[PDB]
Amino acid sequence: DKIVVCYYGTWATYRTGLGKFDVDDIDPFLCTHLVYAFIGINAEGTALALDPELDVERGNFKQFTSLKEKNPNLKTLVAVGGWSEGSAQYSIMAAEPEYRQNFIQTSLAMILEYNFDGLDVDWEYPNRRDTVHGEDDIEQFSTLLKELREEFDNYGLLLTVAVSAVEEAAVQSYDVPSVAKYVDYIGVMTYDMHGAWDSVTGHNAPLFISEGESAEQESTLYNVNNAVQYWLSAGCPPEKLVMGVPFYGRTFQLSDPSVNAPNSPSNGAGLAGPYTAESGYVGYNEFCYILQQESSWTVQTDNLAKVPYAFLDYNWVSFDNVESMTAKVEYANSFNLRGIMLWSIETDDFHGLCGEGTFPLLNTINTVLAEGST
Numbered sequence: 582d583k584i585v586v587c588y589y590g591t592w593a594t595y596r597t598g599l600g601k602f603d604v605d606d607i608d609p610f611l612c613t614h615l616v617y618a619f620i621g622i623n624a625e626g627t628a629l630a631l632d633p634e635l636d637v638e639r640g641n642f643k644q645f646t647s648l649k650e651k652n653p654n655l656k657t658l659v660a661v662g663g664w665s666e667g668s669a670q671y672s673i674m675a676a677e678p679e680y681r682q683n684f685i686q687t688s689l690a691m692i693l694e695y696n697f698d699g700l701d702v703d704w705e706y707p708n709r710r711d712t713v714h715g716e717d718d719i720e721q722f723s724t725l726l727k728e729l730r731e732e733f734d735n736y737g738l739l740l741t742v743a744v745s746a747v748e749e750a751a752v753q754s755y756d757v758p759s760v761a762k763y764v765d766y767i768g769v770m771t772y773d774m775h776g777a778w779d780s781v782t783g784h785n786a787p788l789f790i791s792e793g794e795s796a797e798q799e800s801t802l803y804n805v806n807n808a809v810q811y812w813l814s815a816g817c818p819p820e821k822l823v824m825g826v827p828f829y830g831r832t833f834q835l836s837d838p839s840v841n842a843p844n845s846p847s848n849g850a851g852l853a854g855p856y857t858a859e860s861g862y863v864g865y866n867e868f869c870y871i872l873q874q875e876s877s878w879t880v881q882t883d884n885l886a887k888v889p890y891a892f893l894d895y896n897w898v899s900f901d902n903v904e905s906m907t908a909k910v911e912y913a914n915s916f917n918l919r920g921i922m923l924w925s926i927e928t929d930d931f932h933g934l935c936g937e938g939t940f941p942l943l944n945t946i947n948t949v950l951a952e953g954s955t
């Protein structure tokens with residue numbers, strides 16, 4: 582009954598050398614659900630491949646779903662949306678019955694032709710960013726899910742969502758009971774809690790209160806516990822709540838290197854990984870290697886938030902390791918959550934270069950779920 586929902590950022594195939602991660606780098610027995618990120622839409626609802634040369638011409642959709650030839654119990658979904666896809670087109674599509682119907686039919690066509698087992702909806706986000714219809718998106722999102730479910734039930738297909746985590750974000754976008762009603766599960770994106778957009782350093786996925794935070798109005802802080810408890814309290818049953826964890830960290834440039842605790846002033850985004858190549862975030866594979874190769878880094882545990890962080894002069898990095906992943910899965914076990922969702926498989930230490938075996942984060946998730954440790 583416990584599930585492990587693995588997202589694959591399919592553009593990782595274009596990384597070079599040790600960062601390159603293709604479909605055949607996936608271990609299909611370390612996930613119960615594997616999700617191909619991402620397809621997109623136009624405003625008229627037509628589902629479409631975002632990288633047709635890879636997805637279609639080079640057969641990547643079908644190579645991905647063919648992982649079921651190795652693990653016949655694996656479910657392989659396709660995810661529509663994502664951060665880069667924005668909100669406007671989803672807002673327009675969801676408001677019009679004709680566009681919703683077009684989305685249902687065109688997404689179903691892709692699912693069946695490429696042998697996917699269902700659809701994950703990652704609209705980021707109803708009533709936010711470049712939304713066109715504003716608060717109406719909250720209703721139209723639930724209507725879209727209802728209509729997808731009605732059609733998908735004719736084929737036995739899965740329907741899931743990925744959602745923003747903390748209360749102040751969730752209340753802008755979702756009616757929780759009507760979202761939960763139509764989906765097989767809700768993947769709560771319990772990460773990106775803090776990042777280089779903030780004025781101070783902070784953890785990507787702190788479990789509880791963090792160093793440097795006030796305990797007054799503790800329920801308003803951006804942490805995993807507050808988000809999970811919000812979703813449970815708002816009507817998501819535990820058997821439909823899948824708790825997200827990150828396989829990447831976020832990086833900052835300190836304002837003053839001598840002030841290097843969490844919640845210390847930051848000047849902006851920090852280092853980039855050699856393969857992900859974007860200032861402000863780093864894959865676990867990249868950062869564990871950096872730490873292994875450069876002894877000058879200081880790694881500390883925030884024993885309030887239950888997560889590690891590292892600093893070296895101006896660099897300050899929040900990340901998650903085997904120990905913090907263990908704490909996260911133990912938390913999920915303690916609340917009888919349906920399982921663990923991860924963004925994303927291609928930045929685990931998939932080559933085992935950091936000395937804890939291949940896929941240390943993903944193996945940790947599977948081990949702690951199987952053992953039931955709370």
Ligand SMILES: CC(=O)N[C@H]1[C@H](O[C@H]2[C@@H](O)[C@@H](NC(C)=O)[C@H](O[C@H]3[C@H](O)[C@H]4N=C(N(C)C)O[C@H]4[C@@H]3CO)O[C@@H]2CO)O[C@H](CO)[C@@H](O)[C@H]1O
Pocket residue numbers: 588590592619631660662663664665666703743768770773829858859862923924
């Ligand atoms: C297709 C594309 O736009 N590729 C971009 C790439 O965009 C990525 C990254 O910004 C991802 N960030 C990280 C830390 O991996 C980002 O991940 C988001 C994702 O959209 C959300 N959806 C989920 N689910 C669990 C459904 O989790 C979140 C994650 C984590 O926040 O996704 C976008 C694409 O939407 O960005 C790089 C440079 O950043 C660019 O080269 C190009 O590869």
